[PDB]
A = this chain, B = another copy of it.
Amino acid sequence: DVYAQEKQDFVQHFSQIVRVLTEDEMGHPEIGDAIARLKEVLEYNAIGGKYNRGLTVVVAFRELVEPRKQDADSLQRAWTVGWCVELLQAFFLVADDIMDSSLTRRGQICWYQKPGVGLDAINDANLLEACIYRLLKLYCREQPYYLNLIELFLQSSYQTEIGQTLDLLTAPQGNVDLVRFTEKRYKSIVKYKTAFYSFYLPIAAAMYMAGIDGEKEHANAKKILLEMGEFFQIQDDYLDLFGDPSVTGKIGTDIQDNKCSWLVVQCLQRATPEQYQILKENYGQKEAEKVARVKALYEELDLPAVFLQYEEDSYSHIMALIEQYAAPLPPAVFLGLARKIYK
């Protein structure tokens, strides 16, 4: 597996990242306490995932750049840009867990729930964002793709924040209106809140680093990747309720939080007016017994089977898109990633 090959060198580079970020303290000991906090935030929130987004930069880089140009220094930059993608995710997740009133992430208590942290986590999240641009300046400032990467990270952040806005507006607390929950609304939410930053960003970053800056090549890569991103968020929604928290590392809140989940959208398409009534009375509430009623209804409608069928249809569709849109990039770049999220 090409991801497993690269993983150990990638994960080890995190020590170099922590080191260069905390060497700001060298020439300014007055900010020592702040740098110690930054280190703690990095170690708690950036470590412990599967690193699929960051590894995707490294894997794609190795398949897009001639082996003769994969010197030690170029590899260091690739690992760094990979870690920047992981830091962007950590920024979004720390804030997301506050806004979604979540309990655990990656098997441990959410950062904001940690005693002594609380809403100070807002500033911690913004520091994670700032670290991205410090790392890009330190490692990539002299490279011809520097400005392209800065603009890519900024644009991806904007798109993701627009998506979070749609997510939050469609799920007002204490206000259950099921008519908002359409398939058309759902697809817009997930394209912006997840697809750009999770799938387009890491491959696009590798493309720029390899000198592939063509409008056309980026457009074709988007066609494949935004569809993969849609599937990924559908899977995330399914696992919120039907996944095992010991595997997922997080407790689900979509029902309690009144979210426009793929599950509720599918339920609404299949529900009798009597099932619709059950949904309306129990959705968007914290009571455990009410959450249980919605899950029972989902099982009654065999939504787990609908998801399995969607996974298969989606895989076939993404493979057809790869056949059409991959060239001139090697199909392996997209196939490797697909194997990672569908398997």
Contacts and interface: CB of A to CB of B under 8 A. Distances in A.
Interface of A: 30-31, 33-34, 37-38, 95, 98-99, 116, 118-120, 122-127, 130, 133-134, 137, 147, 150-151, 154, 157-158, 161-166, 168-169, 172-173, 188, 191-192
Contacts of A154: 130, 133
B119 A98 contact: yes
A37 B164 CA distance: 12
A126 B159 CA distance: 11
B130 A161 contact: yes
Q: What 9 pairs across the A-B complex have the smallest Cβ distances?
A: A34-B165, A30-B188, A130-B158, A133-B154, A123-B164, A34-B162, A120-B168, A127-B161, A34-B166
- Copies of chain A in the complex: 2
B166 A31 contact: yes
Nearest to A150: B150
Nearest to A153: B133
Provide the main secondary structure of the chain A interface.
helix
A298 to B, nearest CB: 27
A98 B125 CA distance: 14
Contacts of A166: 31, 33-34
A151 B122 contact: no
A130 B147 contact: no
Contacts of A34: 162-163, 165-166, 169, 192
A290 B237 CA distance: 49
A163 to B, nearest CB: 8
B120 A99 contact: yes
Contacts of A98: 119, 122
A147 B125 CA distance: 24
Contact of A123 (B123, B147, B165, B188): B165
A37 B169 contact: yes
24 contacts: A30-B188, A31-B166, A31-B188, A33-B166, A33-B169, A34-B162, A34-B163, A34-B169, A37-B165, A95-B122, A98-B119, A98-B122, A99-B122, A116-B172, A122-B122, A123-B164, A123-B168, A124-B165, A126-B157, A127-B161, A130-B158, A133-B154, A134-B158, A150-B150
